[PDB]
């Protein structure tokens, strides 16, 4: 089980990600709170020539 | 409470995985760092704990901070390369003690030595003269050995240990299958 | 097997207990690193290679299940096992067993494939070995350039140099072997043949035009002083310019094998050194010349100078284009590539002259120009 | 350029992508351009030396996009613009 000992670092990086997403995921409520007006959307596919 | 900085240096050589001694004692001394950092946290949570190795290319693993939540994660991926390096191992922390936030925190650096020293007596008396000159508390902890335990390190400590009144202590652990936590926790430095 | 190892470990030959004492002491102390160092000390000693068949398999299994020490020592000792036994049938299963045994901890696949290809470089197969050699040089090109694995790669370029198929690669890798030498710890008795096939390999190398890079490094001129000066003389003549044909003729007929067919190509190679030297000797003062110096120095007729300059322009080291009417020789940009001391002294003279002329014009124009315009 | 710069730059070579190096002067006495872009890439040497970190000089230019030209021009009030003609040309032709 000496080869599977590196999984703990991966889990620490994952839980560190879940611990660090609270800020940038928290600003969604204060930045995207409410659209103050209404705007109509018309779809038109464009081509640039990722 | 007590206002002082804690610096620990662990060995990353391949001498820490021998089957005669403890079964990969790296985790045992890791738990020692855990109980001394949690013990200092229970005494005074304002103390910062740093992590760095003694390899050829020294790398600052964790900056001095009281938050051990990420230090517990940084204790992994030790990158077991190199054998031993003493000069820049002392100079990488004893000179970096000025980068701490709190200037009132005393200077205290420990180190886990798991490989024989390659420097001659001249480097021992020069580095010992520098450490005694700048008056930094130095605790010598030697895990594992090949030659005799203390031949020149005795004079290294006696010439390095100043302020005999409540000064620094020497930690010498004998061979044995028992854990090292209770043996290194005996002096007053732990707790 | 630890209690059962004392029987066959204690019983040995007359001189074996000298190392078996510390071997069994470090064995009882269970110091895997000191045990490995003692194993390398036992293999390094010139043993009789008769009673080691037990310690090779015992230390082989110990090195297999220890999973502590760098398995590169296991690669070395298994190279001594396959070298002592000379059994290529079990070498694939042994080396493959070491590949399956070594986990994903250290980048040892370069030495594993290096040992596999090195053992496969015999008369059995060459193409697949060259392909896996290209794989060896292609996999790991990162920062750890210890060059030791690349020195073994140079040994593989020597076993590949045994083939007359491609000689150019042995010179390109021979420059790396020329630059990777650290000290003189290895026996010079091998450096005799190393400099022998290195000088002959450099001469027969058709992938370079100048030889000043080989002789330029002091290690070869310092390690060839003991050997006979028959090669240093012809290398200094082939490097500093061949103005005569007697020495290059005697050394052109001295080496009988593999030099008769390549002699003409070597002449077509050295026929350009007189050109680059004759155009770089005079930097100024009517650089324009005539074919009399080429035909006189190269003892060639007038009808072949057109093919000579055509080959000179065909190689690509010179771009000379002459708009002459009567026979003339005008050259262009060229590189010495070896050395020029008179061009260093002349470089200081012409450089100081150019600098003091630019300074003279700056003080001349700026002197009154700064006072009248500012 | 000290030898320790390979260890200083090696950290930002491991954690960060290929880092560019810039050497400047502590005293503004150098007349030349103070900025020199030195890319941290490993190059193969012909003489056979082991592969190490090589600092290749990359050309650099000092320009401002929108506002820093206005701020610098307002703070100086002594420097002149291009001003094609006699003085801006003859000064370059003299110095």
d(Cα C144, Cα C231) in Å, to the nearest integer?
37
Chains with ≥3 CB–CB distances under 8 Å to C: A, B, D
In chain C, which residue's Cα lies nearest the Cα of B20?
C30
**Residue C219 contacts by C-beta under 8 Å, 6 or more apart in sequence?**
C178, C181
Please state the separation of Cα B50 from the chain's center in Å. Answer: 11
| Number of residues that make up chain B | 191
Interface probe with B: pick from D5, D7, D14, most Cβ of B within 10 Å: D7
d(Cα B75, Cα C354) in Å, to the nearest integer?
63
Does D7 touch chain B if contact means CB atoms closer than 8 Å? yes
d(Cα B89, Cα B91) in Å, to the nearest integer?
6
User: Is-contact D48 C177, C-beta < 8 A?
Assistant: yes
Please name which of C371, C369, C358, C360 lies closest in space to residue D94, comparing C-alpha atoms.
C369
C202 CB-side CA count, 13 A: 23
Residue C98 in tokens: 């070491």
d(Cα D83, Cα C299) in Å, to the nearest integer?
65
- Angle, vertex CA C279, rays to CA C273 and CA C282, nearest 5: 130
Within 58-117 of B, beta carbons closer than 8 Å to D belong to: 59
Alpha helices in chain C (DSSP H): 5-10, 17-28, 32-44, 53-65, 72-85, 88-101, 109-120, 127-139, 148-161, 168-179, 188-204, 212-216, 218-223, 230-240, 246-250, 263-270, 273-280, 291-297, 305-315, 342-372
Does B73 touch chain A if contact means CB atoms closer than 8 Å? yes
d(Cα D92, Cα B50) in Å, to the nearest integer?
56
Distances from the Cα of C210 to the Cα of B166, C157, C311, C335, D32, angstroms:
74, 22, 16, 10, 38
**Considering only CB atoms, which chain C residues are within 8 Å of B115?**
none
Point out the residue among B70, B76, B77 whose CB comes nearest to the CB of A16: B70
Does D72 touch chain B if contact means CB atoms closer than 8 Å? no
Task: Give the DSSP per-residue string, C300-363.
Answer: --STTHHHHHHHHHHHSS-------SSS-B--------S--SHHHHHHHHHHHHHHHHHHHHHH
Tell if the CB–CB gap between B77 and A13 is shorter than 8 Å.
no
User: Is-contact C94 C81, C-beta < 8 A?
Assistant: yes
**Residue B183 contacts by C-beta under 8 Å, 6 or more apart in sequence?**
B173
User: Is-contact B5 B107, C-beta < 8 A?
Assistant: yes
Distance from D11 to chain B by nearest Cα, in Å?
8
**Residue D91 contacts by C-beta under 8 Å, 6 or more apart in sequence?**
none
Residue D49 in tokens: 């030396």
**Considering only CB atoms, which chain B residues are within 8 Å of C68?**
14, 17-19
Q: Which helix (H) or strand (E) holds B142?
A: strand B137-142
Tell if the CB–CB gap between C366 and D94 is shorter than 8 Å.
yes
Would you tell me the crossing angle of helices C148-161 and C127-139 to the nearest 10 degrees?
Answer: 160
- Angle, vertex CA C259, rays to CA C254 and CA C261, nearest 5: 140
In chain B, which residue's Cα lies nearest the Cα of D7?
B57
In chain B, which residue's Cα lies nearest the Cα of A2?
B24
User: Is-contact B71 A14, C-beta < 8 A?
Assistant: no
**Considering only CB atoms, which chain D residues are within 8 Å of B57?**
7, 10
Q: How many CB atoms lie within 10 A of CB B131?
A: 19
d(Cα B139, Cα C371) in Å, to the nearest integer?
73
Q: Which helix (H) or strand (E) holds B9?
A: strand B6-10
Experimentally, how was this structure solved? cryo-EM
Residue D28 in tokens: 């503004």
**Residue B23 contacts by C-beta under 8 Å, 6 or more apart in sequence?**
none
Q: Do chains B and A touch (3 or more CB pairs under 8 A)?
A: yes
Does C172 touch chain D if contact means CB atoms closer than 8 Å? no
Point out the residue among C143, C179, C369 whose CB comes nearest to the CB of D48: C179
Q: DSSP state, C121?
A: T
Q: How many CB atoms lie within 10 A of CB C165?
A: 10
**Considering only CB atoms, which chain D residues are within 8 Å of C177?**
48
d(Cα C57, Cα C329) in Å, to the nearest integer?
72
**Considering only CB atoms, which chain C residues are within 8 Å of D47?**
175, 178-179, 213, 217
Task: Give the DSSP per-residue string, D4-73.
Answer: THHHHHHHHHHTSSPPEEE---SSTT--S-S--EEEEEE---SS-PPP-EEEEEE------SSSHHHHHH
Q: How many CB atoms lie within 10 A of CB C32?
A: 21
Radius of gyration of chain D (CA): 19
Distance from D67 to chain C by nearest Cα, in Å?
32
CA dihedral D2→D4→D5→D7, nearest 10 degrees, is 170
Q: Phi and psi at residue B134, in whole multiples of 5°?
A: -75, -5
User: Is-contact B47 B105, C-beta < 8 A?
Assistant: yes
Q: DSSP state, C251?
A: T
d(Cα C52, Cα C81) in Å, to the nearest integer?
9
**Residue C346 contacts by C-beta under 8 Å, 6 or more apart in sequence?**
C283
**Residue C61 contacts by C-beta under 8 Å, 6 or more apart in sequence?**
none
| Cβ neighbourhood burial of C183 (10 Å; 0-12, 13-18, 19+) | exposed
Please name which of B9, B116, B6 lies closest in space to residue B54, comparing C-alpha atoms.
B9
A49 CB-side CA count, 13 A: 1
Task: Give the DSSP per-residue string, B45-67.
Answer: TT--EEEEE-SSS--EEEEEES-
Does A27 touch chain B if contact means CB atoms closer than 8 Å? no
User: What are residue B111's DSSP bridge partners?
Assistant: B140
In chain B, which residue's Cα lies nearest the Cα of D14?
B59
Tell if the CB–CB gap between A16 and B73 is shorter than 8 Å.
yes
d(Cα B179, Cα C135) in Å, to the nearest integer?
48
**Residue C84 contacts by C-beta under 8 Å, 6 or more apart in sequence?**
C49, C52, C53, C56
**Considering only CB atoms, which chain B residues are within 8 Å of C32?**
17-19
Q: How many CB atoms lie within 10 A of CB A33?
A: 8
Tell if the CB–CB gap between D46 and C373 is shorter than 8 Å.
no
Residue C180 in tokens: 């990777």
Radius of gyration of chain B (CA): 16
d(Cα D87, Cα D73) in Å, to the nearest integer?
19
Residue C256 in tokens: 């009988």
Distance from A8 to chain B by nearest Cα, in Å?
8
Chains with ≥3 CB–CB distances under 8 Å to D: B, C
Distance from C68 to chain B by nearest Cα, in Å?
7
Please state the separation of Cα B78 from the chain's center in Å. Answer: 16
In chain D, which residue's Cα lies nearest the Cα of C174?
D48
In chain B, which residue's Cα lies nearest the Cα of D12?
B59
Please name which of C11, C9, C45, C12 lies closest in space to residue C28, comparing C-alpha atoms.
C9
Please name which of C276, C285, C293 lies closest in space to residue C340, comparing C-alpha atoms.
C276
Q: DSSP state, C50?
A: S
Tell if the CB–CB gap between C370 and D94 is shorter than 8 Å.
yes
Does B72 touch chain A if contact means CB atoms closer than 8 Å? yes
User: Is-contact C69 C53, C-beta < 8 A?
Assistant: no
d(Cα C206, Cα C265) in Å, to the nearest integer?
9
Q: Which helix (H) or strand (E) holds B109?
A: strand B108-113
**Residue C71 contacts by C-beta under 8 Å, 6 or more apart in sequence?**
C63, C98, C101, C102, C106, C108
| Cβ neighbourhood burial of B4 (10 Å; 0-12, 13-18, 19+) | middle
Distance from D89 to chain C by nearest Cα, in Å?
11
Q: Which helix (H) or strand (E) holds B141?
A: strand B137-142
**Considering only CB atoms, which chain D residues are within 8 Å of C145?**
50-52
**Considering only CB atoms, which chain A residues are within 8 Å of C67?**
2
**Considering only CB atoms, which chain B residues are within 8 Å of A12?**
72-73, 76
Distance from C30 to chain B by nearest Cα, in Å?
5
Distances from the Cα of A12 to the Cα of A1, A6, A7, B70, angstroms:
18, 10, 9, 8
């Amino acid at each position: 089980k000496i080869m599977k000992s590196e999984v703990l670092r991966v889990t620490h990086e994952l839980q560190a990600m879940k611990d660090k997403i609270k800020e940038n995921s928290e600003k969604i409520k204060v930045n995207k709170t409410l659209p103050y007006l209404v705007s109509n959307v018309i779809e038109l596919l464009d081509v640039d020539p990722q | 409470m007590v206002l002082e900085s804690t610096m620990v240096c662990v060995d990353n050589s391949e001498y820490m995985r021998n089957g005669d001694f403890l079964p990969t004692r790296l985790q045992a001394q890791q738990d020692a760092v855990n109980i001394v950092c949690h013990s200092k946290t229970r005494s005074n949570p304002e103390n910062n704990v740093g992590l760095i190795t003694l390899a050829n290319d020294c790398e600052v693993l964790t900056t001095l901070t009281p938050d051990t939540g990420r230090i517990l994660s940084k204790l992994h991926t030790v990158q077991p390369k190199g054998k031993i390096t003493f000069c820049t191992g002392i100079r990488v922390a004893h000179l970096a003690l000025k980068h701490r936030q709190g200037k009132n925190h005393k200077m205290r650096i420990i180190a886990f030595v798991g490989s024989p020293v390659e420097d001659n007596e001249k480097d021992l008396v020069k580095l010992a003269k520098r450490l005694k000159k700048e008056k930094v508390n130095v605790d010598i902890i030697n895990f594992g050995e090949e030659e005799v335990n203390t031949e020149k390190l005795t004079a290294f400590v006696n010439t390095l240990n100043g302020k005999d009144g409540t000064g620094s202590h020497l930690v010498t652990v004998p061979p044995g299958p028992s854990l090292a936590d209770a043996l290194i926790s005996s002096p007053i430095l732990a707790g | 097997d630890v209690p059962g190892f004392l029987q066959q470990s204690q019983n040995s030959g007359p001189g074996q207990p000298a190392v078996w004492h510390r071997l069994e002491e470090l064995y009882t102390k269970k110091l895997w690193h000191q045990l490995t160092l003692q194993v390398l000390d036992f293999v390094q000693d010139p043993c009789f290679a008769q009673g080691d068949g037990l310690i090779k398999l015992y230390e082989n299994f110990i090195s297999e299940f220890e999973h502590r020490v760098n398995p590169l020592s296991l690669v070395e000792i298994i190279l001594h096992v396959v070298r002592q036994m000379t059994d290529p049938n079990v070498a694939l299963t042994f080396l493959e067993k070491t590949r399956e045994k070594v986990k994903s901890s250290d980048e040892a696949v370069i030495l594993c494939k290096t040992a596999i290809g090195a053992l496969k470089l015999n008369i059995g197969d060459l193409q697949v070995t060259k392909e896996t050699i290209e794989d060896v040089e292609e996999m790991l090109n990162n920062l750890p350039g210890v060059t030791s694995v690349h020195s073994r790669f140079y040994d593989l370029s020597s076993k590949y140099y045994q083939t007359i198929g491609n000689h150019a690669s042995y010179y390109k890798d021979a420059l790396r072997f020329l630059g990777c030498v650290d000290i003189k710890d290895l026996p010079v008795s091998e450096q005799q043949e190393r400099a022998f096939t290195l000088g002959l390999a450099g001469l027969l190398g058709e992938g370079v035009f100048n030889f000043g890079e080989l002789l330029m490094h002091p290690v070869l001129e310092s390690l060839r002083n003991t050997d006979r000066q028959w090669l240093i003389d012809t290398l200094y003549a082939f490097n500093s310019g061949n103005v005569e044909r007697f020495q290059t003729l005697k050394t052109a007929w001295g080496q009988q094998p593999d030099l008769a067919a390549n002699e003409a190509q070597l002449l077509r190679k050295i026929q350009l050194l007189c050109l680059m030297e004759m155009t770089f000797t005079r930097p100024a003062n009517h650089r324009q010349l005539t074919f009399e110096e080429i035909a006189k120095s190269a003892k060639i007729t007038v009808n072949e100078v057109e093919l000579l300059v055509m080959k000179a322009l065909s190689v690509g080291l010179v771009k000379g284009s002459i708009d002459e009417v009567d026979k003339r020789v005008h050259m262009t940009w060229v590189q010495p590539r070896v050395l020029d001391l008179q061009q260093i002294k002349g470089m200081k003279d012409r450089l100081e002259f150019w600098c003091t002329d630019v300074k003279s014009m700056e003080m001349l124009v700026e002197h009154q120009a700064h006072d009248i315009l500012t | 350029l000290h030898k320790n710069d390979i260890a200083i730059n090696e950290l930002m070579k491991r954690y960060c992508p290929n880092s560019v190096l810039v050497i400047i002067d502590v005293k503004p006495k150098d007349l030349g351009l103070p900025t020199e872009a030195y890319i941290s890439v490993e190059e193969v040497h012909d003489d056979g030396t082991p592969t190490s970190k090589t600092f290749e000089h990359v050309t650099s230019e000092i320009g401002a996009e929108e506002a820093e030209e206005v701020g610098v021009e307002h703070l100086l009030r002594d420097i002149k613009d291009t001003t094609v003609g006699t003085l801006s040309q003859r000064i370059t032709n003299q110095v």
